[PDB]
Structure 1
Amino acid sequence: LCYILDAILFLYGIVLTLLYCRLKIQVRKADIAS
């Protein structure tokens, strides 16, 4: 069953690329204003 593994890994990629964007905008608003 390859498709359920692809589904859970796609969900993992979605939540990790959401958390990366959250940390990226936090680093942006921290370092932009010194």
Structure 2
Amino acid sequence: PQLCYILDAILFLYGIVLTLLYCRLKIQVRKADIASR
């Protein structure tokens, strides 16, 4: 009930943090590749 909803909200926040870190890694790899090219 309440515990599942709270845990699912923190799962969503985990998804937010993971897509932010993956976007930062994406721009870092793209900047390294556009410096290499």
- TM score, norm. by length of structure 1: 0.88
| Pairwise CA RMSD | 0.7
Instruction: State the 4+ residue runs in structure 1 displaced beyond 2 angstroms.
Output: none
- TM score, norm. by length of structure 2: 0.82
Higher-Rg structure is: 2
Q: What is the total number of aligned residue pairs between the two structures? A: 34
> Any residues of structure 2 matched to 1:1-34 within 5 Å, and which?
1-34=3-36
